[PDB]
Amino acid sequence: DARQRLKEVEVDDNGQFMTTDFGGNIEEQFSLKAGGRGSTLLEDFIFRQKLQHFDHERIPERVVHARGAGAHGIFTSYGDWSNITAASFLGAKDKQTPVFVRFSTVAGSRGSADTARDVHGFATRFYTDEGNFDIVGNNIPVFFIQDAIRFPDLIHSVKPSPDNEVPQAATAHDSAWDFFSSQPSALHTLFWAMSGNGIPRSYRHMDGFGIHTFRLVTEDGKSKLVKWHWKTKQGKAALVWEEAQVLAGKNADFHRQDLWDAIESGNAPSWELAVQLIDEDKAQAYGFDLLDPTKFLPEEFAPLQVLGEMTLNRNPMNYFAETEQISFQPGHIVRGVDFTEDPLLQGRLYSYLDTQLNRHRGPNFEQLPINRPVSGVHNNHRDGQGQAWIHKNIHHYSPSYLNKGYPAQANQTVGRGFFTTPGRTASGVLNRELSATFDDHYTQPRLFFNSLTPVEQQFVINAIRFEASHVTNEQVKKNVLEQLNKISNDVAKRVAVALGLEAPQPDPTYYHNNVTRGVSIFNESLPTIATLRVGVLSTTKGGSLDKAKALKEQLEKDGLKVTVIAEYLASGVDQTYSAADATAFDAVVVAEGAERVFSGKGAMSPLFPAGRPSQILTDGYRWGKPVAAVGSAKKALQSIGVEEKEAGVYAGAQDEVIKGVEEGLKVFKFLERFAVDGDDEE
Amino acid sequence: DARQRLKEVEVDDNGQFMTTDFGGNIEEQFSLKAGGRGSTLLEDFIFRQKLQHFDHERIPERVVHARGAGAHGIFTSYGDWSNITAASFLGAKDKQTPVFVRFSTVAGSRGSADTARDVHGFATRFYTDEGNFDIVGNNIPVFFIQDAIRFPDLIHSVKPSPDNEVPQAATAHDSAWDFFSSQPSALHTLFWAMSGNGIPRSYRHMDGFGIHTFRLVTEDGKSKLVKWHWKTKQGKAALVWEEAQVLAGKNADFHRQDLWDAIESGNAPSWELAVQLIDEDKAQAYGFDLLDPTKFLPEEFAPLQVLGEMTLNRNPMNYFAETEQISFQPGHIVRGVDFTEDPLLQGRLYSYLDTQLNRHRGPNFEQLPINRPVSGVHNNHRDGQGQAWIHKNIHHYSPSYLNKGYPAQANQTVGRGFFTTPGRTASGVLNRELSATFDDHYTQPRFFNSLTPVEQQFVINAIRFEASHVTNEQVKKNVLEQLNKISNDVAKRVAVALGLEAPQPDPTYYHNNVTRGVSIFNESLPTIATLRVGVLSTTKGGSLDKAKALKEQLEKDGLKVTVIAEYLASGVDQTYSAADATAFDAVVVAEGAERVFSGKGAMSPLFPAGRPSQILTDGYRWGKPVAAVGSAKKALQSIGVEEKEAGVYAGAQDEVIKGVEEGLKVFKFLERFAVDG
Amino acid sequence: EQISFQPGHIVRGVDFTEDPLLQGRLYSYLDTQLNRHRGPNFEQLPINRPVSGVHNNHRDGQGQAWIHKNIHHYSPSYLNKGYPAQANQTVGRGFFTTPGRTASGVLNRELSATFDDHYTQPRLFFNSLTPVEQQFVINAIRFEASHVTNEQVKKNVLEQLNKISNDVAKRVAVALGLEAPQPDPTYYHNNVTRGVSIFNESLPTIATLRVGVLSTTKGGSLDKAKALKEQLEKDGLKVTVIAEYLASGVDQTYSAADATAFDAVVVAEGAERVFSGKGAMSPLFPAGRPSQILTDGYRWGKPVAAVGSAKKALQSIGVEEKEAGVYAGAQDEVIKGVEEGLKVFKFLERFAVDGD
Ligand code: HEM
Ligand code: HEM
Ligand SMILES: [O]
Ligand SMILES: [O]
């Protein structure tokens, strides 16, 4: 149990009487009043201590990544990696370290939709025996900007306009695209956010990236440059934008429920921890500066080397005390790892320490149960708001004769202390510049786009088309066009069509045809269909429900989560048509006999909105999901104009439908149903 | 200008050089580094002062009503109401007072959807010349509970489950309906939230209520029990649930953008301030206790009397500094008004003062510009976090010989001070009880009688939707037993969706009484100004030119028209990819645009498959006025809709416009929604 | 520093009264913790936690240190099975307001007329003190009011003091150079009550009381001071031997010593050398410091003593062994006297009284 250390602070209220926060049993359902219908007394200490705690429940949301969810788990190392790092948690085969991971979006506030289009956070804490080590990552390997001092500008431009606070959780407005086109470094991450990475199917279907080049350091002090990767064992998978939008309204907790259900049902998700390793003397040897956070390292140049695997198997007990209160920091570093001169990472180190003082209203936030290490804290820090400990050492200073030198200094050779990479040097003038090696803002965006499938490329273009069409200012849109044209003339011309702007002329300085692996989502089927959702649309009339039950039981044998849907909650029905939507499922199957609710009287009922079963089937097909119908229910396929032998469409008896649906869930999205530019011309 | 007093804190950065927050021109786009590719220096004071302010931007959200928006305006008194109130802002005909209003939901956090189903906040501050007076109200005249000590229990049960923080901005889960059925006083507000009041069309289409009985007190101390009412001059209007769900994802800012656009375009919304006035001897005269906030006073027993009008005509300059930071309080009371022994109002007075300490992390929040009164502050308060003034009176205590007695005491006789109603008394033992007069929780919900038949189905279908999400079978059964105490028919129709058997009739509280003013769909809209028409066109053929002429004549009646086509050609406001029917009050197909509902024109890569047909289908099924000009009838036929239907218009441009504008007064065509049976 | 006291921290079996001062305290101690502790969870601090267990539906707040198991954090509720459950007078040992307390009358912003006597009990308190104890009060008032620059405030104070006692006002008026006001006898009375005097009762024990022994590193004084100390410590006294420097057996130097630190001062024999002449002029302490300590100790009413030839030190400051609280002779004589004097603690014979 990864939460084992947290059980000492867990409070069980069952079987007990109500109390105040300072003890004493009470009743707290009536205010103390001066007379039968009199005014409430100031001396009602019970009322005041109850309402004051309610009044003070909220803490500030995170300044970025305010919307997200998390879970506990275990990380297991696959070997003794002392040959590359002194990091304790990687020092032996099958060594296990408790983790907590929080996934998130970036721009939206606390109550915004999971399926907004956005970069996604992927923050992992290792509770190692030599301190907490945090990898505060994203599901995209490059970031918008090259210097941390520009972070407020980026975030202000993509967060709501400061006059009306419109729009929520979205880059589709003037200020954001004004910034993307005025700061061309941002276009690489923008392309990633405009792809499937911006609308993933779940937290469990994302890769993770530390983005920055870090350093692994051995006991003798030798170092190597390193990139952190998390590779999902569930496979990468993404939605389509028109589906993500409906899902934002139908279930804004789609992603956090996904992770919770997967863990509750015993299908804990896993990611493998992998690294790219680079010699120090090759930091600038691959066509870009490895200090540049707007660049990723093509796997053709440095392949991923798996070090271990992380499994998230325990949900939190109290979301606020654990998920909301946890405080990640890239400054949470340990012996065996070091920073680099990445100007974006450099400022992060200051920013995450500082912002905790705003979120937690004091300096003792590492004493919170979810932030505490398991390795012990011994120093001369004292006092501060909410000090939860009572220190014994009264000589709280160093050096000291009176405390005998304890707590004692630890460094590279004594006490396994942290040490900066010994060979690191500084050379040159103090400057407020960026290295000229950071100047190329277009080559890698072109590289990313080249490496996507044709329909995947169309998704990127259609996302940009959707986003840029919200920009009111004409010049901003033309500025966007000029910047896009430096990535690819074809992308600019296809985006320009939606904008009503003239197709720009080629500017080939950065054009190229190179491609790289690992970057696509839709060119690979899932390695497993466990936890994937199947909506079975049935009816309470006739014998349809009995068949849906058998259809459900066999589908569950393969590890799928099946929801039987009908007019009302008859025996065996999991959900009503009124409460059902196609966004909640990865495949839709119409049970035999349920074709009655797709036409005629059966489709017009007071118990669900008009056309709901037809709409669920239409949404699922148009959003590329595997859809099916058993036996006579093929008439439902007919009523929305879907043909039986289309790709990802399955009609027949129960068993062939079951096999066809499960095969289609591996494909996940059938991209034959999405038009590409040039298809419609006569 | 209602924002006139805020002018002296506005800061213009145009034409200026970047500075730190302590002065000095700077550059702040490059960190100071030791060498060309070096680490950033701690001595970079520019970097840290910029990032420190960014790192500390967020303050805690409101514990409830976290999601909302507001605007400035003016209240105008219609008369000299000194015969009923000593309140100065009501003391003269045509006397104008600046106001700020915040509308909101209740349950959702700050980034939740406007069109979630919820009770809605309607908070108004009068910046009167005798102090700030706030009417912190809802768009529903009754509240869930009868004693403020139960507010954490109510809010904990409605807000997300504390284990996983699911669901956001929704009562449709186990704990809420567990609470609704375990605490039956909640059923009245529950019914209101399950009606059109839970999913309003906009803030400007809501009524508002102070809920509590207050007291108006004249200069000589005579008092009247009073109910505050805001009556919208735009008319009440609501969505349908299946449309509000889609709108929650397509535009989470639907309501705050609507308010912003109405004001910016010069269509300032208005509400009339009206009161119900009854003597003290009527507190228990109408079959319920007026100190009970779960009951409202039927207008048949005390009609509305209008006192003035408020109009919101100026948007904020900085959302955070004005809308986010404003701190409403029911304790914000002035001379001429007093509280009552309402046990729910009683505890609010403590809570709103106390909670400001959490949201603003200091005692000086009334010094913030949007919280400041216009009438002057003179007392012996000193210091505190962020003290923004410098006090001259060094003898900051009373009584005192040294300050000559200033600042001096004010009361009923001298200085127009506040005074509690002189006639109020206390009698009885100290008790942690409620009056037995609070016992009836079912008569007034049996509100349901006063809705139109389809309006009633909406309530049933909302309860059917929400209760179906409840996983515990016994909670569902407990819910049905409580609904059966209000109406056996309601229990039976809800039990159907739950696959349960409704209990046998429990006629204790049954009755067939009705009351006016609580329905929404029984009344056409008085104005269609600011209402929005989506015109579906296509870049091919001569459709665009006709859609522009159609737009031109529709704007002449004050409507907001959006022309939709495959891309942003000349005259196109929005692409099909970016468009959705939730954004419009009416959908009209321009002549020629039938080409994008079938054939090749419907399969362009520029928008998702079937998007034009989806838009017209959405608008019809959600009850909107829908229409098509000339050859565009084909689009109506392609989705099975016919000319002879209510709220569907076909023919020439002149005929379509006349029909659409009249259907927009109807607003929702309820013949398209099936009723049980 | 962190502990947070509240009069509202009340338990079953105790209840409040309608004291208008107490009533407002209950509000202000809860509220002020939000300022001092910047959050609502200050009762979770180790020094503030009860030992009896906390079970309620409070959640979240800054610095929330626990992880609650009950996901149904509300009442009433079927899903939590009614737990945590309500407790009242008859079930659960719950708190309950006194059943018989009643409210009656108009809501008012007033005080009861029964509160209107501000002078009788101040008079009663002053009556029940010893004569020199009364003089300490008068000399405190004379010191305090002489700092008031405003003439009218000084007369306002006298006008109010004259309501308590005309003699008190007269004696204070002297120090202020103001006229003796004429009697205002409305609240004058001669009643006394027990238990309010400090100086009318000797101390029940002298354990922990402090004795400073003034000695010198020259001669054999330190040897005798060590013997004097060992016997005084037998009675539970804390003894500090003082000399020019920290020789063996010295607890404190004259430079660091002051009479304020001790309850009795006794000069060890031979130490009279540091009270006049060369022994009083040394770079190791401020000039006259041993004589200042003895002078201070005497003038502040302490038991002071000298052993043997050290009585010259008492003569050097004009103090004679005849006096109460002054002891001389050999060691055992001085020990028994000083220990007797410590029970009296302060010798009020050394403080002049108005017209004595
Ligand atoms: C490669 C670049 C970056 C990555 C991968 C990244 C990732 C993340 C993630 C995952 C979180 C959420 C942690 C959680 O779930 O609690 C977060 C929060 C945050 N980030 Fe970043 N971020 C990056 C850039 C930056 C920069 C450049 C700054 C400032 C200079 C910054 C400042 C912050 C702050 C202040 C928070 C809030 C932390 C808290 O309130 O506890 N980030 N970031
Ligand atoms: C008839 C009953 C009630 C009405 C009409 C009402 C209305 C409102 C409204 C409109 C707001 C939003 C103010 C804004 O826009 O900033 C609000 C917030 C709030 N309410 Fe209520 N509410 C009621 C019941 C209660 C009760 C019983 C309590 C506690 C005992 C309570 C505590 C609060 C708090 C703490 C806030 C946050 C205020 C702030 O952070 O500035 N409410 N309420
Ligand atoms: O971030
Ligand atoms: O509220």
Cα(C176)–Cα(C146) distance, integer angstroms: 6
Same domain, A408 and A262: yes
Find chain B residues with C-beta within 8 A of A147's C-beta: 29-31
Question: What's the burial of B275, exposed, middle or buried (CB within 10 Å: 0-12/13-18/19+)?
Answer: buried
What range defines the domain where residue C262 resides?
A: 206-356
Per residue, the 3-state secondary structure of B72-96, as one string, reads EEEEEECCCCCCCCCCHHHCCCCCE
Q: How far is the CA of A52 from the centre of ligand 2 (A)?
A: 14
Same domain, B543 and B410: no
CB of A64 within 6 A of ligand 3: the answer is: yes
Cα(B250)–Cα(B588) distance, integer angstroms: 20
Tokens linked to C54: 């906390």
**What's the one-letter identity of residue B10?**
E
Strands (E), chain C: 67-68, 102-106, 210-214, 238-243, 252-253, 264-267, 304-306, 326-327
Length of chain C: 356
CB of A62 within 6 A of ligand 1: the answer is: yes
The percent of chain A in helix, strand and coil, each rounded to the nearest 5, is: 35, 15, 50
Q: Does C109 touch chain A (CB under 8 A)?
A: no
Which residues 32-91 on chain A approach chain C with CB closer than 8 angstroms?
32, 34-35, 38-39, 42-43, 45-46, 48-50, 52-59
Same domain, A455 and A376: no
At B103, which helix (H) or strand (E)? Answer: strand B96-104
Q: How far apart are the first and last CA of chain A?
A: 63
Tokens linked to A305: 């080397």
Q: Does A497 touch chain C (CB under 8 A)?
A: no
**What's the one-letter identity of residue C36?**
R
- Partners of B561 in the beta sheet? B533
Give every CB contact of residue C94 below 8 A, 6+ residues apart in sequence: A17, A18, A25, A26, A27, C12, C86, C87, C88
Cα(A339)–Cα(A331) distance, integer angstroms: 9
CATH number at residue C163: 1.20.1370.20
| Coil/strand/helix, residue B274 | strand
Number of the ligand closest to the Cα of B356: 2
DSSP B321: I
Cα(C265)–Cα(C259) distance, integer angstroms: 7
**What's the one-letter identity of residue A94?**
D
Cα(A237)–Cα(A260) distance, integer angstroms: 18
Last residue of a domain, one of A430, A464, A481: A430
Instruction: Yes or no: say if B429 and B437 are a contact pair by the CB < 8 Å rule.
Output: no
Q: Is the dihedral of CA A401, A404, A407, A409 positive or negative?
A: positive
CB of A330 within 6 A of ligand 1: the answer is: no
Per residue, the 3-state secondary structure of A507-559, as one string, reads CHHHCCCCCCCCCCCCCCCCCCCCCCEEEEECCCCCCHHHHHHHHHHHHHHCC
Active site residues of A: 65, 138
Question: Residue A419 phi/psi, 5° resolution?
Answer: -150, 135
Instruction: Yes or no: say if A364 and A372 are a contact pair by the CB < 8 Å rule.
Output: no
Are the Cβ atoms of B61 and A110 closer than 8 angstroms? Answer: yes
Residue C37, sorted as left (phi over 0), alpha (psi -120 to 50) or beta, turns out to be: alpha
Cα(A591)–Cα(C58) distance, integer angstroms: 47
DSSP B43: T
Cα(B190)–Cα(A571) distance, integer angstroms: 28
Give every CB contact of residue A631 below 8 A, 6+ residues apart in sequence: A592, A593, A652, A653, A654
| Coil/strand/helix, residue B204 | helix
Of residues B190, B189, B155, B193, the one with CA closest to residue B175: B155
Alpha helices by DSSP H, B221-292: 241-250, 254-264
| Coil/strand/helix, residue B488 | helix
Same domain, C288 and C316: yes
Q: Residue B188 catalytic?
A: no
Same domain, A85 and A149: yes
CB nearest to C105's CB, from B156, B426, B472: B426
Same domain, B161 and B41: yes
Find chain C residues with C-beta within 8 A of A390's C-beta: 46
Same domain, B245 and B394: yes
Same domain, A481 and A559: no
User: In degrees, to the nearest 5, what angle opens at C-alpha B288 toward C-alphas B285 and B291?
Assistant: 95
Last residue of a domain, one of A380, A398, A430: A430
B277-298 exposure pattern, b = at least 16 Cβ within 10 A, e = fewer: bbeeeebeeeebbbbbbbbbbb
Tell me which of A1, A6, A21 to substitute to probe the interface with C (most C C-beta atoms closer than 10 Å): A21
Last residue of a domain, one of A528, A554, A585: A528
CATH number at residue A591: 3.40.50.880
The residue contributing the CA closest to ligand 3 atom 1 is A64
Q: How was this structure determined?
A: X-ray
Same domain, A484 and A593: no
DSSP A322: I
The structural domain count of chain B equals 3
Cα(B592)–Cα(B538) distance, integer angstroms: 8
Question: Residue A71 phi/psi, 5° resolution?
Answer: -165, 155
Give every CB contact of residue A451 below 8 A, 6+ residues apart in sequence: A515, A516, A517, A519, A520
Question: Residue A375 phi/psi, 5° resolution?
Answer: -100, -10
Question: What's the burial of A394, exposed, middle or buried (CB within 10 Å: 0-12/13-18/19+)?
Answer: exposed
Length of chain A: 682
Same domain, A248 and A342: yes
Question: Residue A153 phi/psi, 5° resolution?
Answer: -65, -45
Give every CB contact of residue B249 below 8 A, 6+ residues apart in sequence: A113, A115, A245, A246, A247, A248, A249, A250, A252, B113
Same domain, C214 and C314: yes
DSSP C200: T
Same domain, B302 and B450: no
Q: How far is the CA of A339 from the centre of ligand 1 (A)?
A: 16
Alpha helices by DSSP H, A305-422: 319, 343-360
Cα(A136)–Cα(C54) distance, integer angstroms: 36
CATH number at residue B240: 2.40.180.10
Q: Is the dihedral of CA C76, C79, C81, C84 positive or negative?
A: negative
* Specified resolution (Å): 2.1
Cα(B483)–Cα(B262) distance, integer angstroms: 40
Instruction: Yes or no: say if C255 and C245 are a contact pair by the CB < 8 Å rule.
Output: no
Tokens linked to B404: 């000559």
Give every CB contact of residue A202 below 8 A, 6+ residues apart in sequence: A234, A237, A254, A255, A258, A259
